[PDB]
Amino acid sequence: KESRAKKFQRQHMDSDSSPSSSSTYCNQMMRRRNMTQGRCKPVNTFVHEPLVDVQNVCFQEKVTCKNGQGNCYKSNSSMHITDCRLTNGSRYPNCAYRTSPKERHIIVACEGSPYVPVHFDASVEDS
Template sequence: MAGWVLCMTLLLAALAGVLGQLQYSRFLRQHVDYSQMSAQLGLRYCNTMMARRQMTNPVCKYTNTFVHAPAADLVAACSQVPNSNGMYSTTYAMSITVCRLRGGNTQPPCNYRGRQARHYVRVACQRGLPVHLDSTSTTP
């Protein structure tokens, strides 16, 4: 009986680890773009990135924020002291692009407007990895 309990505990731990990795991978896909793409695409950046990152099918995602910093810098936020809501903030303001859907139609083709800024980024973390972009702010 003890062997069965140990086996189930190990299985559940492994599944939790896999789920955490999947959530982190999804976070990276949806929010991290540390490339020169934003400079190359200019006004078309949001339309291109939202489609490329699979956020326009079957419906257009209304808003999304891309962080233009290394993923490691967002992982580092998870080692900071969380705020009262359990969110972790980056230690410096990062370059971001906020993409918002133009018009009210959420059916493709999607048309986005982008706004660039420098903000601190707040994330939810699990097992030391960011899994949800909570908000951005001009103050830490």
């Protein structure tokens, strides 16, 4: 009863929660999202925008992927997100990140049917 896309949602898509995330949000969240299980994540970037939005991206714009195909795409515009990068030389099992409340574009790799983001690449700075 599980799927791939769904995993991506609870992976980077944190819309559920509200903005203004400065506290140890990521520091823990990232770990609570089953991302620090067994090991520690070097970096990450949550999202404060609704999926429906990110999804439209795959239909709004498109971009190249690691392989070199149009498997990737970029949001037609900026989007609320919560930066999350390791800090204090933290390491597994320890995991400390710096929650950075910001809002900008993003690039994700959508696939399958329907066309939804099943992976996250990295956030953008500007158009």
